[PDB]
Each structure stands twice: as structure tokens, then as C-alpha cells.
């Protein structure tokens with residue numbers, strides 16, 4: 001009875017935790033709304049590609065699924081900023097090619113995980129959606145496509161059913177989750193760059209391409225077949241304040257959109273063949289930041305990944321964080337004296353990191369779109385670089401702590417704040433680098449940042 005678990009959502013987090021527990025003797029039963037994606041090709045995912053960073057890779061590593069995943073992965077050395085008039089600038093993400101990110105297919109990743117879970121001994125049941133949960137009677141309801149319902153008893157319930165969690169609705173009715181929604185004004189549209197067009201325009205095959213435009217932007221991620229998947233991040237509607245400013249409301253036709261592209265991303269528009277067809281057929285996606293005070297009901301049920309912390313995609317960490325979570329949950333469930341202790345402990349350890357990543361993902365928007373290279377900002381950053389060379393065990397860029405390290409998200413954010421505070425005060429009333437005493441600044445770095453180890 002002790003090693004029974006019912007997981008809702010055969011997505012990314014759900015399938016990893018299904019594999020991690022099943023392989024350790026657990027009686028895992030996974031329920032998926034969708035039909036089996038490695039047989040039937042159903043609905044469009046929230047995105048085609050994903051940026052696989054250390055946290056995610058490492059989780060897949062423990063699962064012994066990392067190699068299979070990286071088999072069809074496209075390396076991403078740094079970001080390729082495209083600003084008209086200025087030649088494309090490549091800013092590397094890290095030191096060498098050891099510090100990279102990977103462009104992997106969502107469905108491929110999902111399918112690899114599904115195989116992994118089923119291999120470990122998990123029972124995956126597709127075409128079954130969670131309709132409701134009776135926590136008091138320790139039962140739940142599922143439904144097939146036809147409407148026919150199915151009532152199953154449960155011992156422990158894991159809500160790994162994504163953004164619009166049926167498990168979260170279920171919990172919210174019997175307990176105050178302490179939800180706090182924060183609506184993202186941007187929407188998104190996925191558009192394609194053919195393998196022929198990517199070759200013709202000699203686009204860097206191993207980089208994360210970005211077209212910044214302040215309140216709106218575009219990104220491109222590489223595909224194994226040399227093609228690219230462009231995403232447009234643009235407001236849903238223009239404000240009453242500025243009603244002439246672009247939005248998805250203004251682009252009523254694929255032609256209106258082709259005009260906006262030739263007008264605002266002119267170097268991009270010719271690479272985008274089928275812009276009109278892709279704009280009309282592929283729908284406008286929604287974004288949000290949902291924060292809950294509570295992720296669990298006693299030892300009975302818990303939310304993991306997107307189900308517990310929906311976030312904006314601007315740091316490309318959502319799935320990384322969701323895989324990191326699955327590890328933590330599996331470890332707590334295996335170590336704790338009982339499920340109430342496990343869920344209490346899991347939530348208590350992940351909730352603060354979940355918040356910091358949500359915060360940092362919002363902050364990253366600005367960083368890649370609204371950047372604004374201020375004279376004092378460029379100065380701060382140069383002093384920051386010196387401080388990183390002089391103090392590698394203390395001064396680490398937040399992107400590096402987030403993306404390449406496995407330091408808890410909240411610690412990465414905390415350190416970042418100490419660093420940004422040092423830089424601001426050090427530059428203060430200085431025009432250039434020659435004015436500041438580097439040795440004095442370095443002493444402060446040692447006084448405010450305790451060292452970090454890879455051991």
C-alpha cells in the first residue's frame with residue numbers, strides 16, 4: 001500500500017516522476033487526457049522546441065534518458081541578436097562549448113519519457129482526463145472522449161497535468177490554495193523558417209536568434225533538419241493610452257501580419273515563407289504567472305511542475321524546473337516517514353525556488369527585448385566581467401547560475417541581487433573604469449559573496 005501512486009498528466013514532470021518511482025518498485029498509474037503521442041499525432045503543443053539547460057539535462061541524466069534525448073538535439077552556443085543596420089552580434093552563453101543549451105523537440109522529449117516510464121514499469125492510460133477529485137472518499141473521476149466516466153480509488157495523487165490543472169481546480173474547491181494570478185500581456189505565434197531559407201540566408205545553425213523590439217520581440221530556435229521555429233511575442237491588445245502601438249488585435253489577416261513584419265522585422269520577413277498561412281492556422285498562445293500559497297492537501301495530493309507554478313517562457317526554464325521538481329518529489333516520497341511528511345517537505349523546499357525562477361523569467365523579458373544599453377549599465381557590466389575573472393568562486397553571472405549550475409533558483413537570485421547592488425554602488429559617480437579602484441571593489445566581492453564549490 002506504501003508504494004502506490006496515481007499521477008495525472010503524462011507530460012514532462014509526470015512521466016519523469018512515473019519513471020523514477022516505478023523503477024524503485026512503486027505501483028505507478030499515469031492518466032493522460034490526450035491519445036498516445038507515439039501512435040496518434042494529436043493537438044499542437046505549447047511550443048515545438050525547448051531549450052534544455054543543466055537542471056533538466058541532469059534530471060534526465062539520473063533517469064538514464066539523457067543520451068536518447070540529446071541524440072536529436074541542436075547545440076545553442078549563445079544568443080544571436082538581430083538589430084537592423086547592425087551586423088548580427090553573437091554573445092556566447094558561457095566560457096567554452098561545455099556551457100551551452102540544447103534545442104530539443106517537445107514531442108520527441110515527451111515520447112522518450114513515455115517510453116522510459118513504461119519501461120520502468122509504469123502503467124500509462126491515455127484518453128482519460130481527470131474530471132474531479134473526492135479527497136474525503138479518497139476517489140477520483142476520469143472521462144473518455146465519448147463522455148463515459150470512470151471512478152478510481154487513490155492513495156496518493158500527483159497533479160502533473162500542466163497550466164490548467166484539473167488537480168489544482170480539484171484542490172481549490174476543498175482548500176484555499178492562495179492563488180495569485182499575474183496576467184502576461186504578450187501572446188505568441190509560432191512561424192517557420194524552411195531548411196532551404198536557413199541555408200540561403202546563412203543563419204547560424206547553433207545559436208538562439210532574437211530580434212528585440214522593446215514591448216514586442218521575435219526568437220528562433222534551430223531544428224535537427226536545419227529548419228527554424230520562430231516565435232513572436234507581442235501584446236494581445238494595444239492600450240487605451242497608446243492605441244497606435246502594435247498588437248495581435250491589429251493583425252486581422254496574414255497579410256496585415258506580413259506588412260507588420262516587413263515594417264518592424266524587415267531582415268526576418270523574407271526568411272519567413274508561409275508567414276500568412278502559419279499566422280492564420282497556428283493560434284495565438286496565452287502566457288501567465290500563477291503563484292499558489294499551497295501546493296498540497298495533507299499527504300493525499302500534490303502539484304508538480306506547471307500545475308504548481310505557471311511561468312513566462314523568457315528564461316527557458318519552465319521544463320528544466322519541472323524536471324528538477326520531479327526529482328525532488330521522487331526523492332521526498334522515497335525518503336519520508338509518510339506521504340504527509342514528503343509533500344510538506346517537498347513543497348517547503350521547492351516553493352521558494354519556484355518563486356525566484358518565476359521572478360527571474362519575468363526579468364529576463366527586458367534583458368532580451370527592452371535591454372536599453374545605458375552608459376552606466378555598460379560600465380557596470382564591464383566592471384562585472386573583471387569581478388568574475390578576479391573572483392570566479394564568488395562572482396558568477398545570474399544567467400550562468402540559473403542555466404549552467406544547479407544552485408537553488410532562490411540562491412541564484414539572492415546572489416545576483418548582492419552583485420547588482422555592488423556594481424551599482426561601485427560605479428555610482430564614475431564616468432569610466434579608470435576612476436574606480438578595482439582592488440577595493442574586489443575586497444567587497446569577498447566580503448559579500450561566500451565562495452561556491454563544484455564538490
Ligand SMILES: Cc1cc2nc3c(=O)[nH]c(=O)nc-3n(C[C@H](O)[C@H](O)[C@H](O)COP(=O)(O)OP(=O)(O)OC[C@H]3O[C@@H](n4cnc5c(N)ncnc54)[C@H](O)[C@@H]3O)c2cc1C
Nearest residue numbers: 009011012013033051130162166305306316317318319320
Ligand atoms: C512558448 C513556450 C516556450 C517554452 N520554452 C521553454 C524552454 O525553452 N525551456 C523550458 O525549460 N521551458 C520552456 N517552457 C515551459 C514548458 O512548456 C513547461 O514548463 C513544461 O512543459 C511543463 O511541464 P509539465 O510536465 O508540468 O506539464 P506539461 O508538459 O504541460 O504536461 C501536462 C500534461 O497533462 C495532461 N493533462 C492536462 N490536463 C489533464 C487532465 N485533466 N487529465 C489528464 N491529463 C491531463 C496534458 O495533456 C499533458 O500531457 C515554454 C513555455 C512556452 C509557453
Ligand SMILES: O=C(O)CCn1c(=O)oc2cc(Cl)c(Cl)cc21
Nearest residue numbers: 051079101313314315316364368
Ligand atoms: O537570455 C537569453 O538569451 C534567452 C533566455 N532563454 C533561454 O535560454 O531559453 C529560452 C527559451 C525561450 Cl522560449 C525564451 Cl522566450 C527565452 C529563453
